[PDB]
Write a protein that holds these residues in place. Structure first.
Motif, PDB file in Angstrom:
ATOM      1  N   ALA A   1       0.827  -1.208   0.000  1.00  0.00           N
ATOM      2  CA  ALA A   1       0.000   0.000   0.000  1.00  0.00           C
ATOM      3  C   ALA A   1       0.861   1.258   0.000  1.00  0.00           C
ATOM      4  CB  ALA A   1      -0.932   0.006   1.194  1.00  0.00           C
TER       5      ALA A   1
ATOM      6  N   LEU B   1       5.830  -4.755  -7.879  1.00  0.00           N
ATOM      7  CA  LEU B   1       4.583  -4.113  -8.293  1.00  0.00           C
ATOM      8  C   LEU B   1       4.857  -2.964  -9.254  1.00  0.00           C
ATOM      9  CD1 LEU B   1       1.557  -3.868  -8.173  1.00  0.00           C
ATOM     10  CD2 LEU B   1       1.785  -2.447  -6.118  1.00  0.00           C
ATOM     11  N   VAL B   2       5.801  -2.109  -8.876  1.00  0.00           N
ATOM     12  CA  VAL B   2       6.236  -1.008  -9.722  1.00  0.00           C
ATOM     13  C   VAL B   2       6.665  -1.514 -11.105  1.00  0.00           C
ATOM     14  CG1 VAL B   2       8.089   0.698 -10.063  1.00  0.00           C
ATOM     15  CG2 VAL B   2       6.891   0.578  -7.856  1.00  0.00           C
TER      16      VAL B   2
ATOM     17  N   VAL C   1       3.845  -2.504 -13.631  1.00  0.00           N
ATOM     18  CA  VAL C   1       3.202  -1.369 -14.275  1.00  0.00           C
ATOM     19  C   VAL C   1       4.119  -0.711 -15.307  1.00  0.00           C
ATOM     20  CG1 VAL C   1       2.101   0.871 -13.874  1.00  0.00           C
ATOM     21  CG2 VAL C   1       1.851  -0.990 -12.186  1.00  0.00           C
TER      22      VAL C   1
ATOM     23  N   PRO D   1     -14.329  -1.075  -3.245  1.00  0.00           N
ATOM     24  CA  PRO D   1     -14.270  -2.362  -2.546  1.00  0.00           C
ATOM     25  C   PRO D   1     -13.966  -2.209  -1.064  1.00  0.00           C
ATOM     26  CG  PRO D   1     -12.239  -1.994  -3.738  1.00  0.00           C
ATOM     27  CD  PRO D   1     -13.161  -0.864  -4.117  1.00  0.00           C
TER      28      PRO D   1
ATOM     29  N   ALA E   1      -8.769  -5.162  -0.025  1.00  0.00           N
ATOM     30  CA  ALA E   1      -7.736  -4.799  -0.989  1.00  0.00           C
ATOM     31  C   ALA E   1      -7.851  -5.593  -2.282  1.00  0.00           C
ATOM     32  CB  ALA E   1      -6.359  -5.002  -0.374  1.00  0.00           C
ATOM     33  N   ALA E   2      -7.747  -4.906  -3.412  1.00  0.00           N
ATOM     34  CA  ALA E   2      -7.758  -5.581  -4.703  1.00  0.00           C
ATOM     35  C   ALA E   2      -6.438  -6.310  -4.928  1.00  0.00           C
ATOM     36  CB  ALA E   2      -8.015  -4.583  -5.826  1.00  0.00           C
TER      37      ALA E   2
ATOM     38  N   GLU F   1      -3.178  -7.633  -7.108  1.00  0.00           N
ATOM     39  CA  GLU F   1      -2.327  -6.962  -8.075  1.00  0.00           C
ATOM     40  C   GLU F   1      -2.752  -7.338  -9.493  1.00  0.00           C
ATOM     41  OE1 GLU F   1       1.837  -7.319  -7.093  1.00  0.00           O
ATOM     42  OE2 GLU F   1       1.494  -6.241  -5.206  1.00  0.00           O
TER      43      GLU F   1
ATOM     44  N   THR G   1      -5.829  -7.736 -10.430  1.00  0.00           N
ATOM     45  CA  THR G   1      -6.957  -6.854 -10.711  1.00  0.00           C
ATOM     46  C   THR G   1      -6.482  -5.445 -11.067  1.00  0.00           C
ATOM     47  OG1 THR G   1      -8.453  -8.085  -9.233  1.00  0.00           O
ATOM     48  CG2 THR G   1      -9.074  -5.824  -9.803  1.00  0.00           C
ATOM     49  N   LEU G   2      -5.530  -4.931 -10.294  1.00  0.00           N
ATOM     50  CA  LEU G   2      -5.001  -3.587 -10.515  1.00  0.00           C
ATOM     51  C   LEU G   2      -4.391  -3.454 -11.905  1.00  0.00           C
ATOM     52  CD1 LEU G   2      -3.354  -2.875  -7.031  1.00  0.00           C
ATOM     53  CD2 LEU G   2      -5.475  -1.922  -7.962  1.00  0.00           C
TER      54      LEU G   2
ATOM     55  N   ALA H   1      -7.030  -3.509 -14.617  1.00  0.00           N
ATOM     56  CA  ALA H   1      -7.659  -2.196 -14.632  1.00  0.00           C
ATOM     57  C   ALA H   1      -6.825  -1.206 -15.439  1.00  0.00           C
ATOM     58  CB  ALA H   1      -7.859  -1.690 -13.213  1.00  0.00           C
ATOM     59  N   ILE H   2      -5.517  -1.216 -15.204  1.00  0.00           N
ATOM     60  CA  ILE H   2      -4.592  -0.358 -15.937  1.00  0.00           C
ATOM     61  C   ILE H   2      -4.633  -0.698 -17.423  1.00  0.00           C
ATOM     62  CG2 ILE H   2      -2.156   0.181 -16.325  1.00  0.00           C
ATOM     63  CD1 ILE H   2      -1.809  -0.197 -13.247  1.00  0.00           C
TER      64      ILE H   2
ATOM     65  N   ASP I   1      -7.120  -2.105 -19.049  1.00  0.00           N
ATOM     66  CA  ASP I   1      -8.404  -1.639 -19.567  1.00  0.00           C
ATOM     67  C   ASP I   1      -8.428  -0.119 -19.733  1.00  0.00           C
ATOM     68  OD1 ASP I   1      -9.193  -4.273 -19.526  1.00  0.00           O
ATOM     69  OD2 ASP I   1     -10.570  -4.068 -17.830  1.00  0.00           O
ATOM     70  N   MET I   2      -7.791   0.594 -18.808  1.00  0.00           N
ATOM     71  CA  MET I   2      -7.718   2.048 -18.883  1.00  0.00           C
ATOM     72  C   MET I   2      -6.973   2.492 -20.137  1.00  0.00           C
ATOM     73  SD  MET I   2      -6.999   3.328 -14.993  1.00  0.00           S
ATOM     74  CE  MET I   2      -8.254   3.290 -13.731  1.00  0.00           C
TER      75      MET I   2
ATOM     76  N   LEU J   1       2.047   5.176  -9.196  1.00  0.00           N
ATOM     77  CA  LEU J   1       1.947   4.421 -10.437  1.00  0.00           C
ATOM     78  C   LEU J   1       0.792   4.910 -11.299  1.00  0.00           C
ATOM     79  CD1 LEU J   1       2.766   0.879  -9.043  1.00  0.00           C
ATOM     80  CD2 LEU J   1       4.257   2.524 -10.216  1.00  0.00           C
TER      81      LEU J   1
ATOM     82  N   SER K   1     -12.539   6.542 -21.723  1.00  0.00           N
ATOM     83  CA  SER K   1     -12.661   5.827 -20.468  1.00  0.00           C
ATOM     84  C   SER K   1     -12.617   6.664 -19.185  1.00  0.00           C
ATOM     85  CB  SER K   1     -11.687   4.663 -20.390  1.00  0.00           C
ATOM     86  OG  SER K   1     -10.377   5.096 -20.144  1.00  0.00           O
ATOM     87  N   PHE K   2     -11.689   7.606 -19.110  1.00  0.00           N
ATOM     88  CA  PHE K   2     -11.456   8.348 -17.887  1.00  0.00           C
ATOM     89  C   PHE K   2     -12.641   9.199 -17.489  1.00  0.00           C
ATOM     90  CE2 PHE K   2      -6.649   8.170 -18.787  1.00  0.00           C
ATOM     91  CZ  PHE K   2      -6.617   6.869 -18.373  1.00  0.00           C
TER      92      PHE K   2
ATOM     93  N   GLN L   1      -8.930   1.101  -4.868  1.00  0.00           N
ATOM     94  CA  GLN L   1      -9.002  -0.342  -5.037  1.00  0.00           C
ATOM     95  C   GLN L   1      -7.939  -1.059  -4.208  1.00  0.00           C
ATOM     96  OE1 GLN L   1      -9.384  -0.074  -9.665  1.00  0.00           O
ATOM     97  NE2 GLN L   1     -10.265  -2.051  -9.060  1.00  0.00           N
ATOM     98  N   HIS L   2      -6.721  -0.525  -4.212  1.00  0.00           N
ATOM     99  CA  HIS L   2      -5.601  -1.181  -3.539  1.00  0.00           C
ATOM    100  C   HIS L   2      -5.741  -1.152  -2.022  1.00  0.00           C
ATOM    101  CE1 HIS L   2      -0.967  -1.849  -3.199  1.00  0.00           C
ATOM    102  NE2 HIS L   2      -1.628  -2.994  -3.274  1.00  0.00           N
TER     103      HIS L   2
END
Ligand code: NA
Ligand code: NA
Lengths: 475, 470
Positions: free
Chosen positions: A12, A27-28, A31, A57, A60-61, A63, A65-66, A69-70, A72-73, B94, B114-115, B357-358
């Motif tokens: 987090a 994680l970094v 992405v 939610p 916590a989602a 990673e 899922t995160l 999401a990115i 999809d964005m 990020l 999307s945004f 979300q996180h």
């Protein structure tokens, strides 16, 4: 603490003593690798995407899922990095602009005050002094970064209003004469929004006739000023636009400014787009007269390829911000002379845009921008020539920047069917050519609009565009 | 001739992929090193600009980044406990990387397909959490100042129909009411809106820095008797200096009784909606006409991140949006630039959504609990030391206090507290802010850093004890 509890993901936050460094790095890197894959392969995605439910939610989602999401964005976002994207003043970002915002967010400082941004506040103040120097505003000149050109225009007009009516503390509700400003009919709508916000009303922005080439008519400006005073109104500002939104044209800055000064009107130059020409020896003569402006708006986010947002308002006399903007409050200037930027901006808390600006300016350099600008004009002139060779097409007028507005006016169609012809052409270019032109409302009609910003747009893209235009018209 | 670096941009066909990857990785590794080692740097840093003709080298850029980080304030330090400015959530960092990369524009749907939709839907959901109802929604703004500006603009436009003609023809001066402890962005907003800074009438606050309902009533009648035109009351849910919460239900009832727009500035305290244990403190906010809320503060989203919410989002179209042809999409969404103070806007929704979300509601509930715990440890520490005095009761994870030592005359108290603040920072590596409050200089603790521990607080009071002699 919370970060050891089962109610927070171990990533987090970034542990300042490195205890979760491996997990964070992973994680970094997810992405970074994902985004780099999307950008180095941006041509695989069309200029525009092909088409919730949103709940915050409890837990916590993952990673996974995160990252989805990115993904999809990115996939559902517009893609100006595509060489066929040539429709808006919205460019692919410079590499160091992306990296600058990574740096800015990581240190997460606040432009509100010096103690919340000790390095950035000083860097910004000094940098904008240098930039004001490039515009030729003199040694008292300076300004602030703002989150967008609309805010820059708002602040300039706010200063213009405060200077003319001494309205910082009592407001303007006591006035018997309506304050009005003048601007080209082709000027940006943020002027009307600013006038609304400033308590002047949208109608306080009196439109001035523009020529066939969408440049403000100084003769009509003088006429409107006389007419305004004749109507019992109180003119206090004139706005010249250096690079209109639709056609990219530049008002006659020197003539407009001279008229403004003759009538004791604040002279604001909206150079949100065209202001970038100061980096071009070959073209900056187009801005002649801007050096006498009382204020300037300039958006590096457009022609300087800085990731949004990046914009500034510059004043020839930066001290005016303390005299006719800053709200009553105790002095807290630092020993090296800098002031809390929040006190002299529309915003208080503000993101450190100066990081990406300074880093991008350094990476590209003045010479780099001179080259990019030349390429812009080159591509624009290729569009101009192509239109001229096609009698069924019509230019909006002469061009002043890397923007070409044109439309079909075919004789096999009556005038009232031209909007549908052009709208269908624009749709066809995007759908089958993967080429994006914008279709603004201009002069009561629909026109095609080309903004040649993408450094990876080639002659072949433009040729492909005309080749498809020809088929749509049956040549 | 003139040179462009091979990595100035990212080739969409991968022709400079290897070079841009190396450059990005160098910056990433450098930033990660600085943050995972942030405790190595103190809370505050210890101690010409020309645009170059030629492209700068990569070494130069990396060194600049290094200098920029080392010269910046460092909220990631466990001893940074002085401002509403937190270390960023990892996904917020990020998120801004993602946002800059795609470089979309919130101005219109066309430029952020999307945004724009994500933001509108997210803020409907958040408006729901505040209990604002089915018509509620709003926009993200670059700062709570803009949020307050937009809310007050709407309040003004509704009361005076000023979108097109403005407010210059008025005979009675329009005024608003706010606690004497309310944020100065109200005065700046009033200045901007053409109302003037003096249009914000201060309402007496209690000893605990909460707006007094009875004085509100008195100021309103007084304004009317003085030929003024009241049109809005602003309640503050989490004052800047002391972190206190106005009695929202009582204020709102008084506002509705006088036909005044009810705005709640919940820039800081709004985060309590993610806390089942603490959100009762915002009781009454559900009847607000508008709400300001800054996730950039107590939700750890990297600056900027703020929003203005309206109980009836439609009011943005009737009393804010400037005349223009409607351009509504078929799925119901509108161009956000039309209903915001800003036009072009950075996609803050990316870091907001990813961070929410996180961390999740559970995560925020936990973080908020810890803040209260640390705050209460500070309060208890102050109560044990008769030479220190609390500003009043606390409502959030903020403790404002100062030394009022009897071995000094009251005129020297400011110097005593200024010296203590500097001592704490230099010797203890602990940062408290020192705002002006009630005419004096007060120490201010904002306990946000998730890595601030009891030991930090203990070290603070030990330092305080030494400075006082005890
Ligand atoms: Na008006
Ligand atoms: Na921003």
């Amino acid at each position: 603490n919370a970060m050891d509890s089962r109610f927070l993901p171990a990533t987090a936050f970034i542990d300042p003593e490195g205890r979760n460094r491996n997990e964070v790095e992973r994680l970094v890197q997810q992405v970074v690798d994902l985004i780099l894959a999307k950008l180095t392969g941006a041509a695989e995605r069309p200029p525009m995407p092909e088409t919730g439910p949103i709940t915050i939610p409890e837990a916590a989602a993952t990673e996974a899922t995160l990252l989805q999401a990115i993904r999809d964005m990115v996939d559902g976002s517009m893609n100006p990095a595509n060489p066929g994207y040539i429709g808006h003043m919205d460019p692919m970002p410079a590499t160091m602009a992306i990296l600058g915002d990574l740096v800015a967010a990581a240190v997460n400082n606040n432009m509100l005050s010096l103690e919340m941004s000790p390095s950035f506040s000083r860097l910004e103040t000094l940098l904008l002094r240098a930039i004001a120097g490039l515009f030729g505003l003199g040694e008292q000149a300076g300004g602030v970064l703002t989150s967008g050109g609309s805010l820059a225009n708002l602040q300039a007009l706010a200063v213009a209003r405060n200077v003319a009516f001494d309205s910082v503390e009592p407001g303007i509700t006591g006035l018997a004469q309506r304050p009005v400003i003048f601007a080209s009919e082709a000027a940006h709508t943020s002027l009307q929004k600013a006038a609304m916000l400033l308590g002047l009303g949208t109608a306080a922005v009196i439109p001035v006739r523009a020529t066939a080439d969408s440049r403000m008519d100084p003769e009509d400006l003088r006429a409107r000023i006389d007419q305004a005073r004749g109507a019992g109104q109180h003119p206090f500002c004139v706005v010249a636009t250096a690079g209109t939104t639709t056609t990219g044209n530049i008002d006659p800055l020197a003539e407009i400014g001279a008229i403004a000064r003759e009538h004791g009107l604040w002279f604001h130059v909206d150079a949100a787009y065209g202001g970038a020409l100061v980096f071009s020896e070959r073209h900056r003569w187009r801005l002649a007269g801007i050096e006498q402006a009382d204020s300037i708006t300039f958006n590096p986010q457009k022609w300087l390829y800085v990731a949004k947002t990046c914009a500034m308002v510059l004043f020839r006399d930066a001290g005016v911000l303390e005299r006719a903007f800053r709200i009553p409050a105790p002095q807290m200037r630092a020993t090296d002379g800098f002031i809390n930027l929040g006190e002299i901006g529309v915003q208080g808390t503000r993101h450190a845009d100066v990081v990406k600006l300074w880093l991008t300016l350094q990476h590209i350099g003045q010479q780099g921008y001179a080259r990019l600008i030349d390429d812009g004009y080159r591509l624009a002139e290729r569009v101009v020539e192509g239109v001229r060779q096609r009698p069924f097409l019509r230019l909006a007028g002469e061009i002043d920047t890397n923007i070409v507005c044109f439309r079909g006016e075919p004789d096999w169609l009556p005038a009232e069917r031209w909007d549908d012809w052009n709208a269908a052409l624009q749709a066809l270019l995007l759908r089958e050519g993967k080429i994006f032109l914008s279709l603004p409302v201009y002069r009561g009609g629909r026109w095609l609009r080309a903004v040649l910003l993408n450094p990876y747009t080639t002659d072949a893209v433009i040729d492909a565009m005309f080749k498809q235009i020809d088929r749509f018209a049956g040549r």
